[PDB]
């Protein structure tokens, strides 16, 4: 068929495949001769499911028949598929040994262009990790050294020779020093897995191997030295070489973050268990080289590598990250050089004067930076001379928050953060009534800021309670649950707003809290008799709402 | 203190640089091999540096100078204090007829052009053609460096028988660097062949260069170059479509490029094309859909399904819709029924069921009322399992887009055999009675 019609090859192959597949799969030594002769003279579900879905008779007969049939009949895809599937299924499913070990070791070790070297080296060397110690441990030097003389031969020979030669030790100076120095002095998976597994599993040689290999060394040296030196973590060479190599090599895409985070975390954690160079270089490079890895690693390492450390150090990361991200993602201002003037502080008037002067002098997507900067600066600067900070903070927060889509976020964030860190009725009632009646952050911010600010403190209570209860109840669970729980809990410890708004607005699962808490607290804690008796008796007319009315 | 800023600023702000910087920094600054030798290479030298450093001595560290900087052969002496002195003398003695004559005569009688042509060619005709056309490591290094530098400089600064016929001998003879040969051969062959024998000249590179870049770049490069060059101007269609379609994250690019290039090239030009395209597309879609459905169902039920389900559904729906719409102007029933039932029985249900179920009636149309209808009702009704979108979408779209075989076989088999399992009688009787009674047709003989 190669010299050319589809009905003859398709009908002959499809119509003729049922005799060999049905006869070979239903007639049962026959799998090796039928699969090797039928597959090599020119089906995966029956051979893979029947051979993988199936005690010394099975292992000895299958290993002796498969090893004798494969070794006796193999002298291109049949050897790699049968050897890889049988060795992978038997070695992976096996987790009498003299015949299989002596026959497989003597036949595989005595029976020895990319398919033959890769299939023979990978298939013959992959089963060595699953009287025999001398031939098995000594056959890797002559087989690997004689067969290794292009990345498959060096990777399979170096990984199989280093793993097979180093796994039996749990004459080693020449193999360990030559294999570690030759394999580590020279595609990232072979060098990283072989160098990391051999260097991490292999352990006078540490000073010469670590000093010569670490000092004789751009991605292979930093990745192999950082991964091998950090996976198994004299401190000045590792800390200075790891910090200088990671900061200098990463300061010029997962290799920079993984090598810089692993080398910085392993070097700082392993060396922190001379401080001016590591603290100044690590703080300046880590604070100047800059989503959860940077904030978590920089905040945890900078805040944990120093009670006043977190509050006094949160302003540098918050002001540097917010000022660098806001000044670098938009610019068009005059606050781009705040890292050199604000980051020069890692060596009660010093905290208030430096924080108020640096924040007020350097502060001259906006909801996260304004709310995080105002809440973090106000909470951190106020949680640690009071007339200047209180008058400047109250005048700047009230004038800046009251002098301003941006009115709801600026007024709610500035009023809620400034009022909770220690003309809103027209904008909040008109914007909430028009935005809520003309149809997610407006309901939670307006309901949380209006309910917390209005409930956490004579016409303002009747106008705000009547307008907010009538406008919010005349039209969603946060306003009714927060207003009913805050008004009932704050008022159960004025009766016309709670009785008229609750009785006139409560008329399904959230209505049991007001009637149960109001009826139980009002009836058990004893103009209130008419509203309580009329609202409870008229609203209680199901076992909890009728058991207290008839039993109380 | 002042040695770093004074030596780095004075030595970096401005041979004479090695002797002045090493002599002034070493003589004025009195571990220095890496700092003093890394600055000379990070930004008559071997004779003055080796003679002055070796005669004014500080031994093995001098060998590090060999990693920094006609006169370089003396540097080989630094490796002493036919295999440790012939590389610097033979490689530096001949350091444009001088490059082709000296490199061809010296290399044939027993890397400078690729590393030196990039600086002069990138920092700003006879050397590229003479050096690239006049060219065991000397053939691979000179051919790879001259072919890569000439192909990259000539192709980036804006004939194929020598590079294509000579790349297989040096690559096959030396392999017993894929980005430069694959990008230069694909860009030069596609641009030279499309800006104006492709199976014989292109089958050696894909058949001899194999290993994911060579096997994955041949589908888009051979399909785009062969489709654009062959379509922009009988053995090329059968050999390229049979070898490219039979030789196959590479499944989406190989299946989309091979199906789009084979369907557009075979349909843009007659029962042989429709029968061969329908048999090859039905066999490949049935084998890929059965293998992906069986492996995904066994691996997912025995305990990356979005890429296999989206790629298999988009490739099967796009290939079946493109082949049916482009080709409609015993293996078909088993391949179409097994691929549609096996691939469809495992907002995506309406588009996948409508697009995957419209190919039976749309691709069939004429005839196909017994084998195409008996396998769908028998295979779809003999499996049951847990399905409701394929029966209502396939029965409503197939019965409403034309129906007597599904209502007669489903009503007779379900009503005669029915005497979780009771949900097929109500849905089958309601869907068959509503579709057959609301279809407004004759037939009758059923009430």
Author numbering:
A (entry chain B): 1767 to 1770, 1773 to 1796, 1809 to 1822, 1838 to 1849, 1852 to 1872, 1875 to 1894, 1897 to 1913, 1916 to 1933, ...
B (entry chain B): 3 to 16, 21 to 36, 44 to 56, 70 to 83, 95 to 106, 114 to 125, 134 to 147, 188 to 202, ...
Can you provide the manuscript's text about this entry?
Here we present the cryo-EM structure of the entire SAGA complex where the major target of activator binding, the 430 kDa Tra1 protein is resolved with an average resolution of 5.7 Å. SAGA is organized into two lobes, one of which is fully occupied by Tra1 while the second contains enzymatic and chromatin recognition functions. The interaction between Tra1 and the second lobe relies on a single and narrow interface forming a hinge region. We find a sequence motif that seems essential for the intricate HEAT domain architecture of Tra1, we identify a structural core shared by other PIKKs including TOR, and we illuminate a resemblance between Tra1 and DNA-PK, a PIKK involved in DNA repair.
While lobe B improved only modestly due to uncorrelated domain movements, the resolution in lobe A reached 5.7 Å, thus showing clear density for helices and several connecting loops. The HEAT repeats form a central solenoid overlaid by a ring structure and adopt a cradle shape when viewed from the side. In agreement with early antibody labeling experiments, the N-terminus of Tra1 is located in a short protruding tail containing 10 α-helices corresponding to residues 1–250. Extending the tail, the central solenoid comprises 11 regular HEAT repeats up to residue 928. These are followed by a linker domain containing three helices before assuming a regular ring-shaped, α-solenoid path, of 31 HEAT repeats. Although the available model of DNA-PK does not contain the full set of HEAT repeats, the comparison with our Tra1 model shows that the overall architecture, shape, and size of the HEAT domain, as well as the positions of the FAT and kinase domains are almost identical. The kinase domain nevertheless maintains the archetypal two-lobe fold of PI3K and the loops that carry the ATP binding residues or the catalytic residues in TOR are located in almost identical positions in Tra1. Strikingly, TOR’s helix Kα9b and the negative regulatory loop sticks into the catalytic cleft and plugs one end of it, while in Tra1 helix Kα9b proceeds in the opposite direction to interact with the FAT domain and there is virtually no analog for the negative regulatory loop. The TRD2 domain in FAT is shifted much closer to the kinase forming new interactions notably with the kinase FATC domain known to be important for Tra1 assembly. Within the shifted TRD2 domain, three consecutive helices that are highly conserved among Tra1 proteins (residues 2698–2753) form a bearing-like module that accepts a rod-shaped density, probably an α-helix, originating from lobe B.
